[PDB]
Write an enzyme that holds these catalytic residues in place. Structure first.
Site: not given
Ligand SMILES: CCCCCCCCCCCCCCCCCC(=O)OC[C@H](COP(=O)([O-])OCC(O)COP(=O)([O-])OC[C@@H](COC(=O)CCCCCCCCCCCCCCCCC)OC(=O)CCCCCCCCCCCCCCCCC)OC(=O)CCCCCCCCCCCCCCCCC
Ligand SMILES: CCCCCCCCCCCCCCCCCC(=O)OCC(COC(=O)CCCCCCCCCCCCCCCCC)OC(=O)CCCCCCCCCCCCCCCCC
Ligand code: HEA
Ligand code: HEA
Ligand SMILES: CCCCC/C=C\C/C=C\C/C=C\C/C=C\CCCC(=O)O[C@H](COC(=O)CCCCCCCCCCCCCCCCC)COP(=O)(O)OCCN
Ligand SMILES: CCCCC/C=C/C/C=C\CCCCCCCC(=O)O[C@H](COC(=O)CCCCCCCCCCCCCCC)COP(=O)(O)OCC[N+](C)(C)C
Ligand SMILES: CCCCCC/C=C\CCCCCCCCCC(=O)O[C@H](COC(=O)CCCCCCCCCCCCCCC)COP(=O)(O)OC[C@@H](O)CO
Ligand SMILES: CCCCCC/C=C\CCCCCCCCCC(=O)O[C@H](COC(=O)CCCCCCCCCCCCCCC)COP(=O)(O)OC[C@@H](O)CO
Ligand SMILES: CCCCCC/C=C\CCCCCCCCCC(=O)O[C@H](COC(=O)CCCCCCCCCCCCCCC)COP(=O)(O)OC[C@@H](O)CO
Ligand SMILES: CCCCCCCCCCO[C@@H]1O[C@H](CO)[C@@H](O[C@H]2O[C@H](CO)[C@@H](O)[C@H](O)[C@H]2O)[C@H](O)[C@H]1O
Ligand SMILES: C[C@H](CCC(=O)O)[C@H]1CC[C@H]2[C@@H]3[C@H](O)C[C@@H]4C[C@H](O)CC[C@]4(C)[C@H]3C[C@H](O)[C@]12C
Ligand SMILES: C[C@H](CCC(=O)O)[C@H]1CC[C@H]2[C@@H]3[C@H](O)C[C@@H]4C[C@H](O)CC[C@]4(C)[C@H]3C[C@H](O)[C@]12C
Ligand code: CUA
Ligand SMILES: [O-][O-]
Ligand SMILES: [Cu+2]
Ligand SMILES: [Mg+2]
Ligand code: NA
Ligand code: NA
Lengths: 259, 43, 514, 79, 227, 84, 46, 58, 79
Positions: C61, C91, C126, C156-157, C240, C242, C244, C255, C290-291, C316, C319, C438
């Site tokens: 998931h 392009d 995951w 890819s990324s 982390h 990831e 963001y 925006s 923090h994880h 943040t 924004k 969890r």
């Protein structure tokens, strides 16, 4: 048609064949590790090489033969290569992180010391030092090749590039010998793990970088480079210096400090 | 935004068809599998 | 011609369309997995099986929603469609490499499918932590296929990031500085820098797991002097950044959407918005542990990570307040995209705030590995990233397709989804505070009421997903062709009509310097 | 015998959540001491403190494995 | 343990857990306030026909919305870190107990004097005695003295687990090759429940923790009874 | 540092060739000599079946599963010791 | 060159709305259905 | 060697409508078909292997 | 165990010309051992090897200064 300077690329099959080659290599590695067969992996390696061959052949056709590499296009490729090298630096950073993590805090299973009990490191003043002088020397000779090319000197560019390639091959043969002579193996706990995976990925990059230099050598033999326009040579030189610098960090960290 | 009138307008009847077909296409296969769960946990 | 166009593409718009199709299909897969999760938990006891099949579902998931739905839609889809148009470029810099970033994803997805079909699947989370993910507790091919799936998604990324950074730095009009490019373009460029730097570390980490599982290395195995916690550091050094990466293109679309439907020519405080995105991207690299507040790290390290994590609230918040200040004084158009964006601002704020709760290492001892964390990240992902995606999809669907949606239907769809996601996830705060862990297939009886309500919410969101498919069908079925849109003077991507021609900006824009 | 031992006291060398080295150090200290007191003509009662500390702190399986490896000749720490 | 329809934390059984409750109340007030302010301001922006669409200057207002959040963060971090350092303090325990995670149960070792150890398994639902709790009981509870500072050492003999007791404010990961320490002090006798808190395979949901807190004299009688 | 060399005026091909043959390749030659001096095989150490070495958690995907990829019988013992 | 304009810049046809509904139903339906059948596969496997 | 780049420039700029990956002539088509046949066949084969590996065997 | 001590043997830990640390380490070891013993009741006799080695290797003035500093409470090594 267009009045910008950028390159609209012909529709191409190589992205798809490259992506499929990735599927075949990864599923092929899975078949090799779990179902005792190299078949898919060999197909994937073959299609990957065919894909890279045809894709970069086309980039040569587009630039040397068709003129599409305007200065704006060249500037983009410069950024692209720098960014690619940055990603490669971060890849190696993960292996250095693993090395320092294990070696700065050796666990009781190792003897609570580094190198671990039972590990006898290579002498860093023997072949590792020779390898260090080999790659440093090849950074001098590739810089001589670059300046010869810029000064229009075909003969000395070829000589210097040939020397650079020879030294890369020499490094690779020295490392292959040292792997065989090493009394520890990849299965010798975290010492062997960090040593062989980090120097092994580095050795792979030496082979890649040497191959890239060899491509440049044959394109130079075929007069593709001008004294001002030769980005494939610049990219291969950047990549070569990156390979040299990773080696210096490996040498200081793993071979010397870690010994 | 502004737009031309629909080239091929979709009547409320047509919408009820497309909606039902869409909902069924999600619900029926999952329904079939979930209905038959006990039938799976014994085979 | 069909194969040349759709399999051999070198066109940023067509490649963007492929990514949107791919991500939509992935979103159905991810939705089905989320319903299987919530069916298992929707009453006490066991529905499917033990925690193995259940956590194969949970693991899949997450990978599907993150790697095959959100990133392809936001970066591959909106990014490819919009970034060249917003800078007047003809392009992307590497139009052919761009097509390989796309075609690596169906193989990546196939490898994830294969992982769940062979053996007993990868029931690892995951995060794929060893030793559970190692070759003794997860023997067989499933975890290796999962690692290879990530490798291909990563390549890819990384290549896509190289393409976006190069395009955005190099292919603007010569008069346009970086401080004249639209905020969505900024958001993609910063996202791309985060991908470039973080994915190679993940690649290093999962390659070490691969070799621990198959070449007898012991990077994470104490018997060889390795350390399972090293894997966690390497994973979260990517993980982390990831999150963001998952939200930043969303911020950029929000925006644009809030500016557009407020009738404004520009977002409030443009340079502050750029600063805030760069600040968030930078701080996102120095907070990963923090994880890991329960793994046993020293107290001064926990204090540093508490503090560094909380300071991200400052950019943040700039924004959030700037979006509010963009609404301020607007001639508000209550379009469905505006509804998505308003829901984003509030619900993203709630989720960011429960993130700040979790940043306190002391309280995180009790909250870690509970549903409080699940509540936090589904508010920012299911009600932030997804709302930005839905808002951008309804806003730009007429550009990409040439056809309008039925606005009343799109508003109904928003209303259903809003109820469904809040019913699903708000009670999960209570489940977390009260200690439900969890990755559980079943729970002590006291947790029944809120699990029941949460599962009922997940069915309401399913009704929304189904309705969305019908709405897209209705638009293509009726063929209301766009004539004009408002505000083209400050929304360049619209100025070549709907859809724009295959080639745009063959003659570049004229922009002078003065 | 300065005893009335209850459990291992706080050790400023090991002030953090990870207590692995504390167990390891006291296990080595006990066995180094016990070996010194055999090969040179003394009493192992002098080693008792380290014994109580490592027994208090160390998982039984860790002790058992380390004991097995000392007997095998594969213990990697220096005793 | 949790009870039906619970909204918040389990009642605090230890002083540190009470500190967390008060800290959470403080932080949740701030979360509710900021959330509600943002919701209100959204509604305020959306409910006037008055307009102002020309360029707005942003500098002055951005001082306020960086300095005010900075102050609020400091007002969260100060008590947060006070509690963090309190948890870390030298506490000088009178007892050390080890727990080892396994797939899928916990074992416990009390090796300060006697070499006592035992396994602790979930009671299957089919074997529960009437009135006992589904998924939460164990056959052998962690008997411990109340009102005493106890050192718990946590590790694993296979994959990761995590040893948690919410009403004591405890959660310590169980990692093979590593010995993690936490401190346990129950203000009250009774039975205190927790569950494995790191995904560990097939029966992750089914390896609970049960502490049994009793007066010291009764703890001593229990240990003495194991010779 | 300025090192101890001295050139510039213009860094060009002639200078880099001068560095290649006058400094770089001589250094390789010296290290090659050094290395061929200290070559020759060390006395291989007693085998001890340490549990953190010769790790086998899954058979290798080649040979008999028990030999590393660049196994050297002279210096790489198996988990059970050196080969005959 | 390729076809351009509404309904022409896509790899699927919108020429007939009922053919389209079938296509879209197969497309989204197959993705939504796949996890249910994988779960069935694993439950049936053993 | 002599510099024959101008003759390659003439070949690859010939107005024959061919995409660059085929503009070298019939060899290009052969190499392309080899490559695509291996990719598509290997992919079909990989799918077969999935089907085999998805059920208990050996 | 038995004697026949002639002088301090080669020690692989200190193989080079500078032997300062060899003297220092054996001095520390002797006094560490001695403190350990005179406590638990046992015999300084087990410390004798370190005593012979440091007496062999260490300049008299170094020993004398270190002894004076231990008595003063100013000895900077850990015993
Ligand atoms: C001629 C041959 C016969 C004569 C021999 C007589 C001696 C017997 C020990 C070992 C150990 O030696 C050392 O570690 C120090 C050697 C001195 C370093 C000078 C090397 C500079 C290398 C240059 C590489 C070229 C790129 C430089 C880039 C410059 C760009 C401007 O010595 C070795 C050599 C050379 C080393 C490569 C440099 C690597 C960098 C490490 C980081 C027992 C055998 C001892 C042999 C020692 C020989 C030492 C000589 C050092 C000379 C190095 C400089 C070359 C001169 C130019
Ligand atoms: C769109 C609707 C879809 C349907 C789904 C629901 C959506 C959510 C809307 C629901 C809107 C509810 C507004 C506040 C809810 C607080 C409920 C509560 O009593 O909380 C209790 C605490 C813990 O408290 C305790 O330790 C003891 C509690 C009991 C005290 C003694 C009284 C005894 C009787 C209890 C009576 C109940 C009291 C309730 C009092 C209620 C006062 C409000 O739990 C928590 O921290 C949980 C919250 C964690 C972080 C979320 C904060 C951000 C929300 C601000 C805007 C709402 C966004 C919603 C998101 C959506 C909002 C638009
Ligand atoms: C889009 C995705 C996303 C985003 C943007 C975020 C944003 C944040 N996250 Fe979250 N997070 C996740 C997705 C995300 N997270 C995921 C998936 C996990 C789980 C990983 C796993 O274990 O699987 C997770 C886990 C996670 C943890 C670990 C908890 C644990 O496992 O125990 C923590 C802890 O610090 C955390 C904190 C935060 C913080 C502080 C932010 C901040 O960036 C939020 C900042 C925003 C605001 C604060 C709101 C707006 C601000 C204002 C209105 C100004 C005024 C506010 C104040 C003064 C406070 N997150
Ligand atoms: C982007 C990420 C994402 C999203 C969107 C979601 C959405 C949902 N998630 Fe998921 N979830 C995760 C990421 C996400 N989740 C992660 C990372 C984990 C942790 C994994 C772990 O523990 O290892 C997790 C864990 C998780 C759990 C906990 C499992 C456990 O601990 O045992 C649960 C339980 O209810 C859950 C439920 C749901 C539900 C009901 C939804 C629903 O809200 C989904 C509803 C549907 C949508 C939101 C639409 C999606 C589709 C599109 C947007 C495409 C639209 C098409 C076009 C625009 C063309 N999730
Ligand atoms: C001429 C040699 C000199 C230089 C080295 C050159 C080649 C290295 C090639 C690839 C290295 C890449 C993977 C590193 C993995 C391990 C290889 C380490 C280098 C090596 O070759 O290690 C050897 C072991 O190889 C082994 O296990 C088997 C190795 C083969 C199988 C590798 C399979 C795994 C590949 C995974 C790659 C994932 C990449 C993902 C990138 C994604 C980026 C986003 C060491 O041999 P040994 O006998 O143990 O000890 C020597 C004792 N005499
Ligand atoms: C939670 C901690 C932080 C809370 C911060 C809340 C701050 C609200 C601040 C508003 C002060 C407005 C005074 C402006 C002087 O007119 C011009 O050019 C310039 C026009 C400036 C317009 C500013 C509009 C703000 C709209 C609401 C934003 C809320 C934030
Ligand atoms: C800040 C980074 C500083 C690194 C210092 C490493 C030295 C540690 C000394 C003790 C530190 C406290 C613990 C000891 O622990 C250990 O494993 C330490 C192991 C190394 C950890 C490195 C962690 C950060 C990695 C960031 C990498 C990105 C670099 C990008 C460069 C191009
Ligand atoms: C034993 C045998 C093993 C073989 C394995 C081989 C594996 C990799 C092979 C090495 C890479 C070869 C790259 C050749 C690129 C040739 C095309 C080229 O160089 O193209 C140049 C453009 O550069 C460009 O695209 C720049 C192109 C950049 C390519 C960079 C490639 C980097 C390596 C990628 C793989 C990394 C894997 C990492 C694993 C963890 C063309 O422009 P110019 O040179 O200016 O010419 C124009 C002038 O003539 C005009 O006057
Ligand atoms: C476990 C095993 C996992 C295996 C995964 C394998 C996945 C990949 C299969 C790869 C097949 C690669 C085939 C060759 C690709 C060449 C790309 C290239 O060279 O791209 C160039 C741009 O990238 C640039 O320069 C920048 C430099 C070139 C980048 C080339 C990188 C190749 C990818 C390697 C993986 C990198 C990951 C790095 C971090 C770890 C050119 O871009 P084009 O758009 O083409 O043309 C533009 C025209 O103007 C040129 O005339
Ligand atoms: C989590 C997402 C899932 C949401 C729930 C889906 C909503 C329900 C959809 C309906 O699905 C159908 O339900 C029938 C039962 O109503 C099943 O027929 C079954 O039951 C009938 C009567 O008991 C028999 O006639 C049929 O042959 C037998 O297959 C049928 O297979 C199934 O397709
Ligand atoms: C977490 C990481 C260790 C990863 C590893 O175990 O591999 C370590 C390495 C360097 C450490 C940092 C450095 O020691 C510098 C800082 C020291 C402070 O006491 C805590 C914060 C501080 C910023 C540390 C945080 C954290 O412990 C770091 C970042
Ligand atoms: C100087 C720079 C660009 C100004 C411009 O050239 O337009 C601006 C853009 C955003 C500004 C920052 C943001 O407005 C956020 C902060 C606001 C505080 O009032 C000052 C510091 C503060 C951190 C600002 C410093 C500085 O004025 C920044 C960084
Ligand atoms: Cu043990 Cu989860
Ligand atoms: O990750 O938040
Ligand atoms: Cu994080
Ligand atoms: Mg955890
Ligand atoms: Na050059
Ligand atoms: Na259940």
């Amino acid at each position: 048609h267009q009045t910008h300077a950028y390159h609209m690329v012909n529709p191409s099959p190589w992205p798809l064949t490259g992506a499929l080659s990735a599927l075949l290599m990864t599923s092929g590695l899975t078949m090799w590790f779990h179902f005792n067969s190299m078949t898919l992996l060999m197909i994937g390696l073959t299609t990957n090489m065919l894909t890279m061959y045809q894709w970069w052949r086309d980039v040569i056709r587009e630039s040397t033969f068709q003129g599409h590499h305007t200065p704006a296009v060249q500037k983009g490729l410069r950024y692209g290569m720098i960014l690619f090298i940055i990603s490669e630096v971060l890849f190696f950073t993960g292996f250095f992180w693993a090395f320092y993590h294990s070696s700065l805090a050796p666990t009781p299973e190792l003897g609570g010391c580094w190198p671990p009990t039972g590990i006898h490191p290579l002498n860093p003043l023997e072949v590792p030092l020779l390898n260090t002088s080999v790659l440093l020397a090849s950074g001098v000779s590739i810089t001589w090749a670059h300046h010869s090319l810029m000064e229009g000197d075909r003969k000395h560019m070829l000589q210097a590039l040939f020397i650079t390639i020879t030294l890369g091959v020499y490094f690779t043969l020295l490392q292959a010998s040292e792997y065989y002579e090493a009394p520890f193996t990849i299965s010798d706990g975290v010492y062997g793990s960090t040593f062989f995976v980090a120097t092994g990925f580095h050795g792979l990059h030496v082979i890649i970088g040497s191959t890239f230099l060899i491509v440049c050598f044959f394109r130079q033999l075929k007069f593709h480079f001008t004294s001002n326009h030769h980005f494939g040579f610049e990219a291969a030189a950047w990549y070569w210096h990156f390979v040299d610098v990773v080696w210096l960090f490996l040498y200081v960290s793993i071979y010397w400090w870690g010994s | 935004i502004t737009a031309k009138p629909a080239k091929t307008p979709t009547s409320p009847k047509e919408q009820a068809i497309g909606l039902s077909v869409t909902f069924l296409s999600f619900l029926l296969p999952a329904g079939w599998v979930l209905y038959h769960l006990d039938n799976y946990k014994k085979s | 011609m069909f194969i040349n166009r759709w399999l051999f593409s070198t066109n940023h718009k067509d490649i963007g369309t492929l990514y949107l199709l791919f991500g939509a299909w992935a979103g159905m897969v991810g939705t089905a997995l989320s319903l299987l999760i919530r069916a298992e938990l929707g009453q006490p006891g066991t529905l499917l099986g033990d925690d193995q099949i259940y956590n194969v579902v949970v693991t899949a998931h997450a990978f599907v929603m993150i790697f095959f739905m959100v990133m392809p839609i936001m970066i591959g889809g909106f990014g490819n469609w919009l970034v060249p148009l917003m800078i007047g470029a003809p392009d992307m810099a590497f139009p052919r490499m761009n097509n390989m970033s796309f075609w690596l994803l169906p193989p990546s997805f196939l490898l994830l499918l294969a992982s769940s079909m062979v053996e007993a699947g990868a029931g690892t989370g995951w995060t794929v932590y060893p030793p559970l993910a190692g070759n003794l507790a997860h023997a067989g091919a499933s975890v290796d296929l999962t690692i290879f799936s990530l490798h291909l998604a990563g390549v890819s990324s990384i290549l896509g990031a190289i393409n976006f950074i190069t395009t955005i730095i190099n292919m603007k009009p010569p008069a346009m500085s970086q401080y004249q490019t639209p905020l969505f373009v900024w958001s993609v460029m910063i996202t791309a820098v985060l991908l470039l730097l973080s994915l190679p570390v993940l690649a290093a980490g999962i390659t070490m797991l691969l070799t621990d599982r198959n070449l007898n290395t012991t990077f994470f195995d104490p018997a060889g002097g390795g350390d399972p916690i090293l894997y966690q550091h390497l994973f979260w050094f990517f993980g982390h950044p990831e999150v963001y990466i998952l939200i930043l293109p969303g911020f950029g679309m929000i925006s644009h959407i809030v500016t557009y439907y407020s009738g404004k020519k520009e977002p409030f405080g443009y340079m502050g918005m750029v600063w805030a995105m760069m600040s968030i991207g930078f701080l996102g690299f120095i907070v990963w542990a923090h994880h890991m507040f329960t793994v046993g790290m020293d107290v001064d390290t926990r204090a540093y990570f508490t503090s560094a994590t909380m300071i991200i609230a400052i950019p943040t918040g700039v924004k959030v307040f700037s979006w509010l200040a963009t609404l301020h004084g607007g001639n508000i158009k209550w379009s469905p995209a505006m509804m998505w964006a308003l829901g984003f601002i509030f619900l993203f704020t709630v989720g960011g705030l429960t993130g700040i709760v979790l940043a306190n290492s002391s309280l995180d001892i009790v909250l870690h590995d509970t549903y409080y964390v699940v509540a936090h990240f589904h508010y920012v992902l299911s009600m932030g990233a997804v709302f930005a995606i839905m808002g951008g999809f309804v806003h730009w669907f007429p550009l990409f397709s040439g056809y309008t949606l039925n606005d009343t239907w799109a508003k109904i769809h928003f209303a259903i989804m809003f109820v469904g996601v809040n019913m699903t996830f708000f009670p999960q705060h209570f489940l977390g505070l009260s200690g439900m862990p969890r990755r559980y297939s079943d729970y002590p009886d006291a947790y029944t009421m809120w699990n029941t309500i949460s599962s009922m919410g997940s069915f309401i969101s399913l009704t929304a997903v189904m309705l969305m498919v019908f709405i897209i069908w209705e638009a293509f079925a009726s063929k209301r062709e766009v004539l004009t849109v408002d505000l083209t003077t400050t929304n360049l991507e619209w100025l070549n009509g709907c859809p724009p021609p295959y080639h745009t900006f063959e003659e570049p824009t004229y922009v002078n310097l003065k | 015998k300065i005893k009335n031992y209850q459990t291992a006291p706080f050790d400023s060398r090991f002030p953090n959540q990870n207590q692995t080295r504390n167990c390891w150090q006291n296990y080595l200290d006990f066995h180094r001491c016990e070996k010194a007191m055999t090969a040179k003509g003394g009493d192992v009662s002098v080693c008792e403190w380290y014994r109580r500390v490592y027994k208090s702190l160390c998982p039984i399986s860790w002790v058992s494995t380390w004991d097995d490896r000392r007997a095998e000749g594969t213990f990697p720490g220096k005793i | 343990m949790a009870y039906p329809m619970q909204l918040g934390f389990q009642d605090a059984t230890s002083p540190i857990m009470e500190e967390l409750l008060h800290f959470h109340d403080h932080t949740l007030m701030i979360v509710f306030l900021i959330s509600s302010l943002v919701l209100y301001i959204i509604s305020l922006m959306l409910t006037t026909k008055l307009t102002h669409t020309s360029t707005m200057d942003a500098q002055e207002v951005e001082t306020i919305w960086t300095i005010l959040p900075a102050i609020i963060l400091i007002l969260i971090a100060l008590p947060s870190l006070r509690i963090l350092y309190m948890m870390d303090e030298i506490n000088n325990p009178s007892l050390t107990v080890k727990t080892m995670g396994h797939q899928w149960y916990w074992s416990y070792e009390y090796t300060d004097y006697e070499d006592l150890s035992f396994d602790s398994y979930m009671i299957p639902t089919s074997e529960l005695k009437p009135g006992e709790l589904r998924l939460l009981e164990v056959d052998n509870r962690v008997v411990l003295p109340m009102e005493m500072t106890i050192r718990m050492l946590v590790s694993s003999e296979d994959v990761l687990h995590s040893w948690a007791v919410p009403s004591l404010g405890l959660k310590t990961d169980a990692i093979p090759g590593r010995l993690n320490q936490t401190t346990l002090m129950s203000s009250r006798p009774g039975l205190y429940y927790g569950q494995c808190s790191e995904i560990c395979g097939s029966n992750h949901s089914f390896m609970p923790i049960v502490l049994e807190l009793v007066p010291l004299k009764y703890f001593e009688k229990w240990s003495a009874s194991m010779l | 540092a300025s090192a101890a060399k001295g050139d510039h005026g213009g860094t060009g091909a002639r200078t880099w060739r001068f560095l290649t043959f006058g400094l770089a390749l001589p250094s390789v030659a010296l290290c090659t000599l050094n290395s061929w001096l200290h070559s020759g095989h060390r006395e291989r150490p007693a085998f001890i079946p340490y549990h953190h070495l010769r790790i086998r958690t899954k058979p290798f995907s080649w040979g008999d599963g028990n030999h590393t990829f660049f196994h050297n019988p002279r210096v790489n013992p198996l988990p059970t010791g050196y080969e005959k | 060159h390729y076809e351009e304009g509404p309904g022409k810049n896509i790899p699927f046809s919108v020429e007939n709305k009922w053919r389209l509904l079938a296509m879209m139903t197969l497309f989204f339906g197959s993705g939504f259905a796949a996890p249910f059948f994988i779960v069935r596969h694993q439950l049936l496997k053993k | 060697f002599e510099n024959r780049v101008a003759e390659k420039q003439k070949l690859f700029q010939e107005d024959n409508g061919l995409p660059v990956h085929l503009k070298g002539g019939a060899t290009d088509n052969i190499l392309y078909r080899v490559t695509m046949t291996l990719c598509l066949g290997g992919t079909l084969y990989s799918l077969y292997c999935l089907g085999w590996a998805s059920f208990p065997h050996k």
